[PDB]
Structure formats: C-alpha cells, structure tokens
Amino acid sequence: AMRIGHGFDVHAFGGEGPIIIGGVRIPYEKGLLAHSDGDVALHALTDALLGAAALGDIGKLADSRELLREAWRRIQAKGYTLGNVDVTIIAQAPKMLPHIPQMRVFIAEDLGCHMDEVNVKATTTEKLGFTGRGEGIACEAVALLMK
Amino acid sequence: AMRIGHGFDVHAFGGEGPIIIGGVRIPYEKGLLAHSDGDVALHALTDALLGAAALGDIGKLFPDTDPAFKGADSRELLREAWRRIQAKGYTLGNVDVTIIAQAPKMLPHIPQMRVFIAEDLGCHMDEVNVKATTTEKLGFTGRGEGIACEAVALLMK
Amino acid sequence: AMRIGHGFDVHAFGGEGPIIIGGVRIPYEKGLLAHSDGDVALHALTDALLGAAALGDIGKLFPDGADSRELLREAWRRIQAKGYTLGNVDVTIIAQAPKMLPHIPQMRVFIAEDLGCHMDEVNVKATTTEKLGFTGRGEGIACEAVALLMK
Ligand SMILES: Nc1ccn([C@@H]2O[C@H](CO)[C@@H](O)[C@H]2O)c(=O)n1
Ligand SMILES: Nc1ccn([C@@H]2O[C@H](CO)[C@@H](O)[C@H]2O)c(=O)n1
Ligand SMILES: Nc1ccn([C@@H]2O[C@H](CO)[C@@H](O)[C@H]2O)c(=O)n1
Numbered sequence: 156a157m158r159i160g161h162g163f164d165v166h167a168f169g170g171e172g173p174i175i176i177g178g179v180r181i182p183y184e185k186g187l188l189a190h191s192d193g194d195v196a197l198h199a200l201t202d203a204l205l206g207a208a209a210l211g212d213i214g215k216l217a218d219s220r221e222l223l224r225e226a227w228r229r230i231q232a233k234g235y236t237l238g239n240v241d242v243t244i245i246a247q248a249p250k251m252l253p254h255i256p257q258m259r260v261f262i263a264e265d266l267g268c269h270m271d272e273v274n275v276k277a278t279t280t281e282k283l284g285f286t287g288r289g290e291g292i293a294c295e296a297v298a299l300l301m302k
Numbered sequence: 303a304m305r306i307g308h309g310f311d312v313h314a315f316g317g318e319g320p321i322i323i324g325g326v327r328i329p330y331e332k333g334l335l336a337h338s339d340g341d342v343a344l345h346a347l348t349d350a351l352l353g354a355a356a357l358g359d360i361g362k363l364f365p366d367t368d369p370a371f372k373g374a375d376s377r378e379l380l381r382e383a384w385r386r387i388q389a390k391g392y393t394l395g396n397v398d399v400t401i402i403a404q405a406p407k408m409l410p411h412i413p414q415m416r417v418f419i420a421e422d423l424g425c426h427m428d429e430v431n432v433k434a435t436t437t438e439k440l441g442f443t444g445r446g447e448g449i450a451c452e453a454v455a456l457l458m459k
Numbered sequence: 460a461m462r463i464g465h466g467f468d469v470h471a472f473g474g475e476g477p478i479i480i481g482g483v484r485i486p487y488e489k490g491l492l493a494h495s496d497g498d499v500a501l502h503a504l505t506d507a508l509l510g511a512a513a514l515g516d517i518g519k520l521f522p523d524g525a526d527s528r529e530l531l532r533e534a535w536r537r538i539q540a541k542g543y544t545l546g547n548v549d550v551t552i553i554a555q556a557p558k559m560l561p562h563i564p565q566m567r568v569f570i571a572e573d574l575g576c577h578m579d580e581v582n583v584k585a586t587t588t589e590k591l592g593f594t595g596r597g598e599g600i601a602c603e604a605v606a607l608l609m610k
C-alpha cells in the first residue's frame with residue numbers, strides 16, 4: 156500500500172529577522188510572525204506526512220523540527236514507512252537555494268531516512284500576489300508513504 | 303500500476319450563507335458564489351481523481367455554460383466522476399484534501415465530510431484525509447474574499 | 460519503488476501576445492514576461508519530475524527565450540539516467556484567461572512526445588480563481604503539477 160499526502164502553509168513577514176526554513180537559519184531583513192518558530196517548510200511537510208497517514212493535520216497534535224519528529228513518530232506507529240518527500244518553497248526572498256542541502260540534511264535526520272528520499276525546491280511568484288509583494292512566505296509539500 | 307492526481311478549486315464569497323464544503327452545510331455570514339452549490343472541496347477532490355485517471359477535469363464532464371448543472375449537487379458530480387474512473391479499471395488508494403479559508407471554522411465539520419466522501423467513493427474513512435488551514439490574513443483567502451481547496455489523490459489498478 | 464513529485468510555477472503578463480503553454484502557442488492580448496518562453500505548465504511539470512527524482516529543480520539545472528520543451532526533455536533524460544520511468548503526470552493550469560480547454564489535447568501530445576510516453580499517462584486541466592487574486596485580476600498565470608515516477 157502506498158499513501159499520498161499533501162501539505163500547505165503560510166506565514167506573514169513581521170518583526171526582525173532572521174527566519175527559519177527547513178530547520179535552517181536564514182538571514183533576512185525581516186522575521187516571520189508565527190505562534191511558533193514559523194518554519195513553513197517543516198509545517199507543510201508535517202501536514203503532508205500526517206495527511207498521507209489520515210491523521211489529519213498538525214493542530215491535531217516552539218520548534219518545528221520537534222513537531223516534525225513527533226508527527227513522524229505517530230505516523231510510524233500506524234505502520235508506515237517513508238517512500239519519499241518533495242517540498243516547494245514559495246518566496247520572493249530571501250534566496251533559498253544555497254540552504255537547500257542543509258535543509259535536506261535536517262529533514263533526512265528528523266525522518267530517519269536517506270537524503271535521496273528528500274527533495275526541496277524554491278520558486279518565486281514573480282512579484283505577484285502576497286508572496287510577490289514580500290508580505291509573506293508560503294510552502295507546499297507532497298509525500299509518499301509505504302505500508 | 304498506480305496513479306497520482308491533483309486538484310484545485312476556488313470560489314468567491316457572496317450573498318447569504320450557509321456554505322457547502324465537503325457535502326456539509328456550514329453556517330456562515332456569507333454564501334458561495336457559484337454556478338453549482340460551490341462545494342470547493344468536493345470539486346478539488348473530483349479534479350484530483352479524474353486527473354489521476356487521465357479523464358481531464360470537472361469542467362469537461364460538466365460545463366459552466368449548461369443549464370442542467372445549475373445549483374448542482376457536487377456530491378453527484380463526484381459519484382459520477384468516480385463511476386467513470388471505476389469503469390476504466392481503477393480503484394481508490396487514498397485522498398488528501400486541504401481546505402484554505404480564514405473562516406468559517408472547518409474543524410468541527412471534518413468528520414462528517416469524511417463520512418460523505420468515504421460513502422461517495424465507496425471507501426473506508428481511513429482512506430480519506432481532510433484538513434484545513436488559513437493564510438494568516440494574507441492574500442484573497444486572508445482578506446476573506448473567498449475559499450480555496452487543493453486535493454491530491456492516489457489510484458490503483 | 461514509487462516516487463512522487465510536486466511542481467509549481469508562475470509568470471506575469473506583459474508585452475504582446477501570444478503566450479506559450481504546454482508547448483502550445485495560444486492567442487491572447489497579452490504576453491508572458493519570462494527569462495524563458497514563459498511556459499509555466501512545462502516549468503511546473505519539469506519541477507514535479509525533477510522533484511520526484513530528487514534532482515532538485517529547473518533552476519539548479521538551468522540557472523536563469525529557451526524552448527521549455529528542450530528543458531523538459533533534458534531534465535527527463537537525466538531522470539531516465541538515474542534509473543527512473545514514467546508512471547503518470549497531472550497538470551493544473553490556473554488562469555482567468557485565455558481559454559485553455561481547446562489546446563489541451565495538443566499539450567498532452569507534446570508532453571507525451573517529450574516524455575516518450577503514451578498520452579493516457581498525461582493529464583492536463585485548467586481552472587479559474589473566479590476573479591480572485593493575482594490570477595483573477597489577470598495579472599498572471601500559475602501552474603501546479605504532480606508527477607509519479609517508477610524505478
Ligand atoms: N483559463 C481557463 C480556465 C478554465 N477553463 C476551462 O473551464 C472549465 C471550468 O473551469 C474547466 O474545465 C476548464 O476546462 C479554461 O479552458 N481556461
Ligand atoms: N478555516 C479553518 C482554518 C483552520 N482551522 C483549524 O485551525 C488550525 C490552524 O491551521 C488547523 O489545524 C485547523 O484545524 C479550521 O478549523 N478552519
Ligand atoms: N525565494 C527563492 C525563490 C527561488 N529561488 C531559486 O531561484 C530559481 C528560480 O526558480 C529556482 O531554481 C529557485 O531554486 C530561490 O533561491 N529563492
């Protein structure tokens with residue numbers, strides 16, 4: 156059995172930087188307003204993982220990495236193993252690209268998997284919408300689980 | 303043989319509520335402007351499902367410039383859609399649905415949604431995940447201009 | 460083992476039409492401002508495919524009038540080299556306009572061609588955002604794609 160999952164998250168820029176994406180501390184003029192550390196990549200990912208497992212979402216269960224590992228724990232308890240993941244960061248800024256490998260390292264660790272089972276990307280919305288206006292950051296993620 | 307699908311839908315708020323999301327009647331100050339009942343979740347879901355099956359989309363099967371589908375039950379679209387997917391030899395792996403809305407509160411309605419979705423697809427509920435999020439007052443959903451929904455689906459032969 | 464991938468792209472309207480989507484020349488009053496030919500459907504799709512293969516994204520490969528089909532083909536060649544084969548793809552075009560629907564069959568033809576697959580393994584769809592957001596106000600076109608690879 157395979158299971159597909161999908162995740163989406165957003166946060167608004169606010170306060171002083173830096174910001175935290177895919178566990179990576181990323182220098183930026185601006186900070187992320189959130190009830191948590193505001194790691195949209197890790198959130199989207201977690202929700203994807205959980206959704207695949209039909210465990211709902213996060214609010215159904217700070218440090219985004221800890222949340223991620225917790226979620227993963229519960230997910231594994233249901234009898235699931237990791238197939239692969241793919242993550243898509245949506246931001247006008249800052250530049251994500253240099254940070255992608257380290258992100259991957261961290262996620263790989265947190266999920267107990269190999270790096271080759273983790274993909275992270277970035278794109279801009281070319282100055283369009285709320286991302287485009289630099290109002291915030293978004294991230295989508297998808298996930299494949301094996302039973 | 304397995305098959306991956308993806309869907310996405312949006313409606314504008316307008317008129318009086320309530321709204322219909324995942325087949326569930328949800329009280330709200332505002333309604334959903336649509337040709338149909340505006341069930342944005344079932345729509346996204348339907349499109350992810352037809353998408354995996356290479357049958358195209360909702361709109362192909364059920365146009366917007368057709369009087370028959372005025373105020374149409376999105377659950378009916380869904381069942382039909384599904385019928386057609388089965389006829390093509392497919393069976394349901396799983397679905398994951400993500401509702402994107404500042405308001406109203408989706409949380410309490412999610413179980414009933416799943417029941418509806420499960421029944422319509424002839425699956426077990428554990429094959430169906432529905433979640434909800436907001437955009438933290440960002441963009442068009444954030445400003446409460448409307449509701450969006452994504453869905454992913456996995457089919458099996 | 461199965462692999463899945465997810466892709467997303469966006470371009471802004473600008474200059475004179477037409478636009479190119481899923482490799483199809485589509486008439487329209489406006490053009491697409493892009494470093495490339497601005498084919499969001501193929502960029503999104505390429506990213507989806509690259510993602511599944513854990514090859515990153517378009518940018519890591521081809522850092523930004525490029526024929527987006529050429530990119531797609533090259534990407535696919537690298538994916539193929541890495542042991543992979545095509546399961547299926549599914550594309551979601553997000554646009555107030557122009558009308559995508561009649562061009563969809565030809566898109567699928569192109570993509571199938573480019574990927575070396577049968578076209579039943581390629582789905583393309585289109586949706587509006589009902590005048591909402593940047594797509595809705597006719598500021599741009601967006602595309603999302605998912606892909607499923609086999610090893
Ligand atoms: N820009 C767009 C948006 C939508 N469509 C077609 O209209 C139907 C309803 O969204 C959809 O089924 C889709 O086929 C289109 O052709 N072009
Ligand atoms: N429109 C919405 C948006 C969010 N939610 C719930 O609030 C939590 C925050 O994302 C989510 O976990 C979700 O449970 C909701 O019930 N309705
Ligand atoms: N906020 C962002 C957005 C995009 N990017 C990178 O720039 C290239 C444009 O697609 C992409 O290859 C993407 O990796 C980035 O580094 N940071």
Ligand SMILES: [Mg+2]
Nearest residue numbers: 164165435436
């Ligand atoms: Mg949130």
Ligand SMILES: [Mg+2]
Nearest residue numbers: 311312586587
């Ligand atoms: Mg629609």
Ligand SMILES: [Mg+2]
Nearest residue numbers: 278279468469
């Ligand atoms: Mg891009």
Ligand SMILES: [Zn+2]
Nearest residue numbers: 164165195198
């Ligand atoms: Zn969040």
Ligand SMILES: [Zn+2]
Nearest residue numbers: 311312342345
């Ligand atoms: Zn709709």
Ligand SMILES: [Zn+2]
Nearest residue numbers: 468469499502
């Ligand atoms: Zn692009």
